[PDB]
């Protein structure tokens, strides 16, 4: 199945064949996400599904890098991500053509900014702390957690999911080990789209464009309920192309809506494997 953290969908062949497809996981999340992506690509389309790895996104990608050219040398690199994976996507496509590599496509799956850009004060770091305390209350059952003041600041990334363990389990509730794994996961990661600065690209990206956020994006961060035209990508890709598939940022990936990406996308596949001449 997995060796290291790269997942194995679609297997290439022995000798020749198609180029791969290299997709990245999404937040809490593995690329079995991807399965019905590739039902919609060319039949012998191999896929490859890079899963979570530690560190900032650039500290993600340096893990990335070596292990895409170990398995696809110079190039071509089709590089696809939803979520969080597109994001993974960019990364390891700036990567790779800084070292010289033949990067030609990249495909984000409504990887969408928020429209207004978030706000990183003391106010706002407080206030979407409340709104993600206001999940653990509803979910968790624990409306009784604390709120502190200057505790957040000092402890880092796992020092703070660190803490929310903490305070709930001291309410009598036992949280399964599962569970906590995946919220931890999940925090971790969105929270290293938070920090991450996004480098120019010169090179052509596909903006797969829904048009809006699920409820719970919204309820976390409200800058999500309004998105722009390009995503937030226009400033840094000069060969943008965004492509409309309608519906919520959650249903992308799936059946039917995924049918529209995989359309378009496998009219870029056939361009490749031709320009391959
Ligand atoms: C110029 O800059 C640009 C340009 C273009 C860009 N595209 C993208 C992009 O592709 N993506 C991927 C899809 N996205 C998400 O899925 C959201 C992620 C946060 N969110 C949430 N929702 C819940 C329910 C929980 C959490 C969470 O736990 N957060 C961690 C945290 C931090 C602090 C306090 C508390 C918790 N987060 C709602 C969904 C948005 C980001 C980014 C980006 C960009 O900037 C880097």
Not at 36 to 54: C, H
Not at 66 to 88: A, R
Not at 238 to 254: N, Y
Request: aromatic fraction near 10%; proline fraction near 6%.
């Amino acid at each position: 199945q997995i060796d290291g953290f790269v997942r194995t969908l679609r297997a290439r062949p022995e000798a020749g064949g198609k180029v791969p497809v290299f997709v990245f996981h999404p937040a809490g999340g593995s690329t079995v996400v991807y399965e019905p992506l590739l039902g919609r690509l060319p039949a012998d389309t191999p896929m490859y599904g890079f899963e979570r790895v530690e560190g900032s996104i650039e500290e993600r990608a340096q893990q990335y890098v070596p292990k895409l050219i170990e398995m696809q040398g110079d190039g071509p690199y089709v590089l696809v991500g939803w979520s969080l994976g597109g994001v993974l996507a960019y990364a390891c496509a700036i990567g790779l053509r800084r070292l010289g590599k033949d990067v030609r496509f990249v495909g984000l799956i409504d990887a969408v900014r928020a429209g207004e850009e978030i706000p990183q004060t003391k106010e706002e770091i407080r206030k979407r702390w409340d709104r993600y305390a206001a999940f653990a209350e509803k979910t968790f059952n624990v409306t009784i957690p604390a709120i502190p003041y200057e505790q957040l600041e000092e402890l880092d990334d796992e020092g703070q999911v660190r803490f929310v363990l903490d305070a709930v389990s001291q309410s009598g509730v036992q949280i399964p080990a599962g569970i906590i794994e995946h919220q931890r996961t999940s925090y971790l990661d969105n929270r290293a789209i938070d920090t991450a600065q996004i480098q120019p690209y010169d090179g052509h990206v596909t903006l797969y464009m829904a048009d809006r956020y699920h409820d719970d994006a919204i309820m976390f961060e409200p800058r999500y309920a309004v998105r722009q035209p390009d995503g937030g990508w226009g400033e840094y890709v000069s060969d943008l192309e965004v492509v409309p598939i309608g519906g919520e940022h959650i249903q992308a990936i799936d059946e039917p809506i995924i049918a529209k990406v995989g359309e378009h996308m496998s009219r870029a596949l056939g361009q490749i494997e031709a320009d391959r001449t």
